[PDB]
Design a protein around this motif. Structure first.
Motif, PDB file in Angstrom:
ATOM      1  N   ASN A 186     -41.993   1.148 -21.944  1.00 51.49           N
ATOM      2  CA  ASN A 186     -42.211   2.528 -21.583  1.00 51.49           C
ATOM      3  C   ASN A 186     -43.626   2.612 -20.775  1.00 51.49           C
ATOM      4  OD1 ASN A 186     -40.879   3.490 -24.613  1.00 51.49           O
ATOM      5  ND2 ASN A 186     -40.636   4.559 -22.682  1.00 51.49           N
ATOM      6  N   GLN A 187     -44.485   1.478 -20.987  1.00 47.19           N
ATOM      7  CA  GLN A 187     -45.799   1.523 -20.128  1.00 47.19           C
ATOM      8  C   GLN A 187     -45.576   0.940 -18.885  1.00 47.19           C
ATOM      9  OE1 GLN A 187     -47.231   3.479 -23.159  1.00 47.19           O
ATOM     10  NE2 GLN A 187     -48.794   2.763 -21.544  1.00 47.19           N
ATOM     11  N   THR A 188     -44.849   0.022 -18.312  1.00 47.46           N
ATOM     12  CA  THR A 188     -44.426  -0.468 -17.141  1.00 47.46           C
ATOM     13  C   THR A 188     -43.088  -0.574 -16.842  1.00 47.46           C
ATOM     14  OG1 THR A 188     -44.339  -2.699 -17.904  1.00 47.46           O
ATOM     15  CG2 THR A 188     -46.531  -1.985 -17.012  1.00 47.46           C
ATOM     16  N   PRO A 189     -42.430   0.657 -17.005  1.00 43.21           N
ATOM     17  CA  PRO A 189     -40.966   0.854 -16.617  1.00 43.21           C
ATOM     18  C   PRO A 189     -40.408  -0.097 -15.375  1.00 43.21           C
ATOM     19  CG  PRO A 189     -41.943   2.777 -16.620  1.00 43.21           C
ATOM     20  CD  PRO A 189     -42.943   1.884 -16.470  1.00 43.21           C
ATOM     21  N   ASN A 190     -40.785   0.047 -14.313  1.00 42.43           N
ATOM     22  CA  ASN A 190     -40.152  -0.423 -13.396  1.00 42.43           C
ATOM     23  C   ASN A 190     -40.198  -2.050 -13.197  1.00 42.43           C
ATOM     24  OD1 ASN A 190     -40.074   2.235 -12.023  1.00 42.43           O
ATOM     25  ND2 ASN A 190     -41.838   2.094 -11.116  1.00 42.43           N
ATOM     26  N   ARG A 191     -41.380  -2.503 -13.403  1.00 42.48           N
ATOM     27  CA  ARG A 191     -41.223  -4.032 -13.624  1.00 42.48           C
ATOM     28  C   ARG A 191     -40.428  -4.411 -14.688  1.00 42.48           C
ATOM     29  NH1 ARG A 191     -46.427  -7.910 -14.465  1.00 42.48           N
ATOM     30  NH2 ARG A 191     -45.351  -9.963 -15.081  1.00 42.48           N
ATOM     31  N   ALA A 192     -40.501  -3.727 -15.969  1.00 40.89           N
ATOM     32  CA  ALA A 192     -39.587  -4.093 -17.009  1.00 40.89           C
ATOM     33  C   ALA A 192     -38.013  -3.969 -16.745  1.00 40.89           C
ATOM     34  CB  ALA A 192     -39.980  -3.062 -18.383  1.00 40.89           C
ATOM     35  N   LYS A 193     -37.592  -2.929 -15.956  1.00 39.67           N
ATOM     36  CA  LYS A 193     -36.229  -2.737 -15.668  1.00 39.67           C
ATOM     37  C   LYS A 193     -35.933  -4.199 -14.818  1.00 39.67           C
ATOM     38  CE  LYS A 193     -36.434   2.123 -15.589  1.00 39.67           C
ATOM     39  NZ  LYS A 193     -37.096   3.065 -14.771  1.00 39.67           N
ATOM     40  N   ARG A 194     -36.635  -4.621 -13.764  1.00 39.79           N
ATOM     41  CA  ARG A 194     -36.467  -5.660 -13.082  1.00 39.79           C
ATOM     42  C   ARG A 194     -36.491  -6.991 -13.940  1.00 39.79           C
ATOM     43  NH1 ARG A 194     -40.267  -3.379  -9.552  1.00 39.79           N
ATOM     44  NH2 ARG A 194     -42.131  -4.815 -10.274  1.00 39.79           N
ATOM     45  N   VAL A 195     -37.121  -7.102 -14.973  1.00 48.42           N
ATOM     46  CA  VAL A 195     -36.982  -8.270 -15.898  1.00 48.42           C
ATOM     47  C   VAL A 195     -35.893  -8.110 -16.654  1.00 48.42           C
ATOM     48  CG1 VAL A 195     -38.070  -9.517 -17.716  1.00 48.42           C
ATOM     49  CG2 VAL A 195     -39.511  -8.818 -15.678  1.00 48.42           C
ATOM     50  N   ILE A 196     -35.542  -7.118 -17.196  1.00 46.55           N
ATOM     51  CA  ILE A 196     -34.332  -6.623 -18.062  1.00 46.55           C
ATOM     52  C   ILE A 196     -33.127  -6.890 -17.330  1.00 46.55           C
ATOM     53  CG2 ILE A 196     -33.054  -4.796 -19.054  1.00 46.55           C
ATOM     54  CD1 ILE A 196     -35.760  -3.745 -20.262  1.00 46.55           C
ATOM     55  N   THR A 197     -33.069  -6.518 -15.928  1.00 50.68           N
ATOM     56  CA  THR A 197     -31.863  -6.714 -15.060  1.00 50.68           C
ATOM     57  C   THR A 197     -31.625  -8.025 -14.839  1.00 50.68           C
ATOM     58  OG1 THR A 197     -31.909  -4.546 -14.175  1.00 50.68           O
ATOM     59  CG2 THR A 197     -31.008  -6.301 -12.946  1.00 50.68           C
ATOM     60  N   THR A 198     -32.694  -8.895 -14.929  1.00 47.72           N
ATOM     61  CA  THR A 198     -32.543 -10.415 -14.686  1.00 47.72           C
ATOM     62  C   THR A 198     -32.123 -10.946 -15.993  1.00 47.72           C
ATOM     63  OG1 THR A 198     -34.427 -10.417 -12.952  1.00 47.72           O
ATOM     64  CG2 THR A 198     -33.607 -12.480 -14.204  1.00 47.72           C
ATOM     65  N   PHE A 199     -32.306 -10.520 -17.036  1.00 46.14           N
ATOM     66  CA  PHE A 199     -31.644 -11.057 -18.383  1.00 46.14           C
ATOM     67  C   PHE A 199     -30.307 -10.575 -18.555  1.00 46.14           C
ATOM     68  CE2 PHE A 199     -35.932 -11.455 -20.365  1.00 46.14           C
ATOM     69  CZ  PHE A 199     -35.741 -12.853 -21.025  1.00 46.14           C
ATOM     70  N   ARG A 200     -30.151  -9.130 -18.027  1.00 48.97           N
ATOM     71  CA  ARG A 200     -28.419  -8.602 -18.390  1.00 48.97           C
ATOM     72  C   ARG A 200     -27.566  -9.349 -17.328  1.00 48.97           C
ATOM     73  NH1 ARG A 200     -25.846  -4.992 -15.659  1.00 48.97           N
ATOM     74  NH2 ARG A 200     -27.688  -4.344 -14.636  1.00 48.97           N
ATOM     75  N   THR A 201     -27.968  -9.652 -16.201  1.00 47.03           N
ATOM     76  CA  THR A 201     -27.238 -10.213 -15.088  1.00 47.03           C
ATOM     77  C   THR A 201     -27.143 -11.880 -14.759  1.00 47.03           C
ATOM     78  OG1 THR A 201     -28.687  -9.726 -13.133  1.00 47.03           O
ATOM     79  CG2 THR A 201     -27.298  -8.190 -13.761  1.00 47.03           C
ATOM     80  N   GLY A 202     -28.207 -12.364 -15.021  1.00 50.43           N
ATOM     81  CA  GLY A 202     -28.501 -13.821 -14.636  1.00 50.43           C
ATOM     82  C   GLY A 202     -28.496 -14.078 -12.935  1.00 50.43           C
ATOM     83  N   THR A 203     -28.939 -12.965 -12.416  1.00 49.34           N
ATOM     84  CA  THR A 203     -28.963 -13.209 -10.925  1.00 49.34           C
ATOM     85  C   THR A 203     -30.491 -12.718 -10.568  1.00 49.34           C
ATOM     86  OG1 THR A 203     -28.364 -10.852 -10.502  1.00 49.34           O
ATOM     87  CG2 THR A 203     -26.675 -12.443 -10.829  1.00 49.34           C
TER      88      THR A 203
END
Ligand SMILES: [Cl-]
Ligand SMILES: [Cl-]
Length: 162
Positions: free
Chosen positions: A140-157
């Motif tokens: 919630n505090q740093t949503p764009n960066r968090a979404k990037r990291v999260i996608t990285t975990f989700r995808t593995g790419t």
């Protein structure tokens, strides 16, 4: 892409002391100097970090040297942590980068507290782990960066980052 280019995109580079998103005195590539409110406490911690009187300003080489030490400590920290090490051991190279990123930003202690997401990462339940990670002050505090990291975990790419 690698851990250094990923964190350099996430934290930026600043050669003058600045305040981070939480309002803390920082320098270079996300190197936290102090949580205290005093600008002088920050200039003192800076000079002690660099080994010279800097007047709040450092060179790109100096920034890069702090960055190198910080990634190193981040990795070592994970490996020494009883809760983090096993998760790290279990993941592939990209997702390892993601954990590192999360540890650099919030510190070993915080990350270690993400009990449920860690167990989910360990079991390889990508989608669930991404959902769980999102329910956090962090996201919630740093949503764009968090979404990037999260996608990285989700995808593995590295997609979130080209
Ligand atoms: Cl240091
Ligand atoms: Cl952000």
């Amino acid at each position: 892409m690698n851990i250094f280019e990923m964190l350099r995109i996430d934290e930026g580079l600043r050669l003058k002391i600045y305040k981070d998103t939480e309002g803390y005195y920082t320098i270079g590539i996300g190197h936290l100097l102090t949580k205290s409110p005093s600008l002088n406490a920050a200039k003192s911690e800076l000079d002690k970090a660099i080994g010279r009187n800097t007047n709040g300003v450092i060179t790109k080489d100096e920034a890069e040297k702090l960055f190198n030490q910080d990634v190193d400590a981040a990795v070592r920290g994970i490996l020494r942590n009883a809760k983090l090490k096993p998760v790290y051991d279990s993941l592939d190279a990209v997702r390892r980068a993601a954990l590192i990123n999360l540890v650099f930003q919030m510190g070993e202690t915080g990350v270690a507290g993400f009990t449920n997401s860690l167990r989910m990462l360990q079991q390889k339940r990508w989608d669930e782990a991404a959902v769980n990670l999102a329910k956090s002050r962090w996201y919630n505090q740093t949503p764009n960066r968090a979404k990037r990291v999260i996608t990285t975990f989700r995808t593995g790419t590295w997609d979130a980052y080209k």
